[PDB]
Every structure is written in structure tokens, then in C-alpha cells.
Design a protein around this ligand. Structure first.
Ligand SMILES: NC(=O)c1ccc[n+]([C@@H]2O[C@H](COP(=O)([O-])OP(=O)(O)OC[C@H]3O[C@@H](n4cnc5c(N)ncnc54)[C@H](OP(=O)(O)O)[C@@H]3O)[C@@H](O)[C@H]2O)c1
Ligand code: NA
Length: 298
């Protein structure tokens, strides 16, 4: 017998790696909003509910979200649908089936104060619509399905998809100088790490259901966006890439404002996850070096 796993958001950065990592846990039914047979559109509340009822999963993994942080400030209804109302429907339908539901969240549920690595039960206080609707979805899942795993993560990148590492690598081909924010700090976390630790956590939580709850799932360490970009260029040049960029200048968040206010401290303690699931979470540089290498075809 094989468990039935429903993956929503299959085409995203994390969803694509979950198509790999979940494939040995059971029979995977993977959808995204373009699917024609099953509704994979998390904003179609009745349709996505019918998909859960049809598939009857043992595990639901939601990798779909509204992730365009600055656009979210002018798309508040859509952000609420994708990050809150849709998550509530998934929680209700999965709990009717007794299914374990996995959901991802964000460092942006916090206000960005301090310089410490945040523990999971600190008070939330989002500064932007993305964080507000993401936190509302967290609460909807907590109330709707006790059998859940919520993984807060940060600064996600991958070989496939759009992200800061690939954007920096492209811009470094063309621009001689880059001005990059140096006062926001967090851990770049790879879609690979998120997908593999998710599969591990699912297996361990099915074995020990007491492990349900909320975890910070990030790579270890911290960097500013500025030093992150510098590292991407260091790796690229070590693999023979020719880059135009000569200087990366650090600038404060106040220098050029964004529609969405961003937290300065995005550090998340990942000790709870390591202890609960018996995993090592490597320093953030490793996963970034790997993606840069793959993007360059090396
Ligand atoms: N700030 C953070 O902490 C941060 C950063 C990255 C990711 N995350 C979280 O980690 C999870 C995924 O990470 P990601 O990096 O994979 O984000 P992503 O790459 O944007 O993947 C987003 C997924 O949602 C899909 N989607 C968009 N509109 C949809 C709809 N109406 N119905 C169904 N699916 C829809 C996207 O498809 P299209 O893109 O083609 O619409 C894509 O498949 C999300 O929970 C996200 O919030 C958090
Ligand atoms: Na069951």
C-alpha cells in the first residue's frame, strides 16, 4: 500500500523540488493553477476543496502562495485568498480526512526588530501584506487542522525559478557596480533543503505525530543581501564565469524605499527543527554555491 500525497503549487521553486523529494513517500498527485483535470487554483476555494475531496490524500503539501511581496501591497484581496483563505480551506478539508498538512510561511511574519535568531513562539507582528496574510494563514491552519507542519523559511532560491541569486548573476553580467541592501540579515534557504527536510519531517511526523507544529526551517548562519550577492559572484568567478561587476556597494534599506516595508532582522533559529527531526542544517553558503554552479552549467 502507498500513501496518497497531494502537492499544491508544484511548479514553484519549492514545489519543483518537492516533486522529487515526495516521490518516494507514496503516490503523488501534483497540481498547480493551470491543471485542467483537477483544480489546482488555490484562489478557487470550491475547486481546490473538490480536489482534496477527490484525491483523498493522506498528506497535503501546500507549496502555492502569493510571493510577490511588493505587488502584494496593491493586491491585498489576492494575497488574502492565496495565503489565508485558501490555506483555511486546505486545513478544513485535510482535517476532515485526517490528513497531515504541510504549509510554508515566512520570516516576514515578524517585525524585524533585534539581532537575535528568533524562536518559533516569539510574538508575530508583520510589517507588510505578505507577512500579514501569511500569518493569518498560519493561524487558520493551527485552528483548522491540528495534524500539521508549518515551516517558516526565508530568502528562498533554486536553480529553477526566479530569485535573488539568479537575478544578481544576470545583473553582474551587465553592470559594473551594484548597490545592494546591507542592513537586512537572514539565511538564504534553498528549495533543495526545504524539499528534502520536508520529506524527512513528514516521515518522522507520521511515525511520531507529537512532532506536529511550527518550525523555522532555514539554512544555518546569516548574511546581508549585499554579502550574499558578493558570495554569488565569488562562486561564479571560481567556476570561470566572466562578470562585469567590479564593486558591490552596501546601502541601507532607507536609501531606496519599496512599496512593502521590510523587516531588518530576518534571522530565524533553526534549532527546534534540528532537534525534533535529527537533521543537520548546513551553513547557507553550501546550497547557494551549488545553485550558482548548476545555473552556470558547471
Ligand atoms: N519571504 C519568504 O519567507 C519566502 C520566500 C519564498 C518562498 N516562501 C514560502 O515558501 C513557499 C513556496 O516558496 P517559492 O519560493 O516556491 O514561491 P514561488 O516560487 O512563488 O511558488 C509559488 C507557487 O504558487 C503558485 N501560484 C500562484 N498563484 C496561484 C494560484 N492562484 N493558485 C495556485 N497556485 C498559485 C506559483 O505559480 P506562478 O508563480 O506561475 O503564479 C508557484 O507554483 C510559499 O509558502 C512561500 O510563501 C517564503
Ligand atoms: Na489515516
Amino acid at each position: 500500500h502507498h500513501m496518497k500525497i497531494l502537492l499544491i503549487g508544484k511548479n514553484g521553486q519549492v514545489g519543483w523540488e518537492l516533486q522529487r523529494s515526495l516521490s518516494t513517500l507514496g503516490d503523488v498527485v501534483a497540481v498547480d493553477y493551470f491543471d485542467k483535470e483537477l483544480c489546482g487554483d488555490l484562489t478557487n476555494l470550491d475547486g481546490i476543496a473538490q480536489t482534496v475531496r477527490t484525491v483523498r490524500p493522506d498528506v497535503v503539501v501546500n507549496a502555492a502562495a502569493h510571493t510577490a511581496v511588493d505587488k502584494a501591497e496593491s493586491e491585498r484581496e489576492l494575497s488574502d485568498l492565496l495565503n489565508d483563505k485558501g490555506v483555511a480551506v486546505l486545513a478544513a478539508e485535510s482535517a476532515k480526512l485526517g490528513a497531515l498538512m504541510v504549509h510554508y510561511s515566512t520570516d516576514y511574519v515578524f517585525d524585524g526588530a533585534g539581532s537575535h535568531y528568533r524562536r518559533e513562539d516569539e510574538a508575530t507582528g508583520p510589517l507588510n501584506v505578505y507577512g500579514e496574510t501569511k500569518r493569518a494563514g498560519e493561524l487558520a491552519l493551527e485552528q483548522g487542522n491540528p495534524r500539521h507542519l508549518i515551516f517558516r523559511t526565508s530568502w528562498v532560491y533554486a536553480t529553477r525559478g526566479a530569485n535573488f541569486a539568479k537575478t544578481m548573476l544576470r545583473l553582474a553580467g551587465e553592470k559594473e557596480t551594484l548597490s545592494i541592501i546591507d542592513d537586512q540579515h537572514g539565511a538564504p534557504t534553498g528549495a533543495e533543503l526545504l524539499a528534502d527536510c520536508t520529506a524527512t519531517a513528514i516521515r518522522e511526523t507520521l511515525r511520531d505525530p507529537a512532532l506536529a507544529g511550527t518550525y523555522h526551517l532555514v539554512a544555518s548562519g546569516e548574511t546581508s543581501w549585499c554579502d550574499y550577492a558578493r558570495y554569488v559572484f565569488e562562486v561564479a568567478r571560481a567556476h570561470g564565469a566572466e562578470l562585469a561587476v567590479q564593486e558591490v556597494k552596501g546601502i541601507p534599506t532607507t536609501a531606496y524605499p519599496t512599496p512593502a516595508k521590510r523587516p531588518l532582522n530576518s534571522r530565524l533559529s533553526n534549532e527546534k527543527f534540528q532537534q525534533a527531526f535529527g537533521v543537520t542544517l548546513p551553513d547557507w553558503r553550501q546550497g547557494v554555491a551549488r545553485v550558482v554552479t548548476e545555473v552556470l552549467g558547471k
